[PDB]
Amino acid sequence: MASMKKKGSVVIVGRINLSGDTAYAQQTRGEEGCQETSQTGRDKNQVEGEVQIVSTATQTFLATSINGVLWTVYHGAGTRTIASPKGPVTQMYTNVDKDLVGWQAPQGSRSLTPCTCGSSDLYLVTRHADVIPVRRRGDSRGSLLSPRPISYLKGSSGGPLLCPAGHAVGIFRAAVSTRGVAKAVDFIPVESLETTM
């Protein structure tokens, strides 16, 4: 009882910069500072952009702001708080059935707008800032136009699928792999987020 520990917070450690003509990853906090920030829950770093790179003590993945909520996957974040300038912030959405969690979007972030285009030509953004064309194949499935080893997609759960106009269509959840090659992806449709809200 006396020695029971607490899990740390999720910490923003970087972002996928989509502000210009060239997408690229940026690191904003190193591993040591990440560990300290996870324990205190106090992160005074400036946040920018729509897609954050996030970490716990044991995992790293992505998180995406849509309509003022920073969304990610439950299999990355669990029920963890997120670190923020004034201390840890509790999830405002948790849905293990959808593999979805969300926190109020951090000050300085920018939010994507949910797609209403009804378009099936999509783009997946990875933690390495690769922009991967994806053809929508169902409510929660899309095929990669150019399949890639699952190694390429690992660590990108929580990232966005976007339409041609840059609206959010979904949150990347899982890869569909045959013999280690991802030919398709599974995503949380933005309509499920909009409902959750």
Ligand SMILES: COC(=O)N[C@H](C(=O)N[C@H]1CCCCC/C=C\[C@@H]2C[C@@]2(C(=O)NS(=O)(=O)C2(C)CC2)NC(=O)[C@@H]2C[C@@H](Oc3nc4cc(OC)ccc4nc3C)CN2C1=O)C(C)(C)C
């Ligand atoms: C050939 O068989 C297949 O293809 N079968 C497919 C399949 O299992 N794919 C697996 C392949 C795993 C190989 C690597 C794939 C590369 C990237 C991948 C984007 C990521 C990701 O990057 N993660 S990550 O690295 O950031 C990380 C780890 C730090 C966070 N996502 C996952 O890894 C998810 C997690 C779990 O999926 C769910 N876990 C949960 C857990 C919950 O509570 C704990 C609640 C709901 C939930 N819902 C789930 C749907 C398995 N997974 C898959 O992708 C399907 C989806 C079953 C059809």
Ligand SMILES: [Zn+2]
């Ligand atoms: Zn759209």
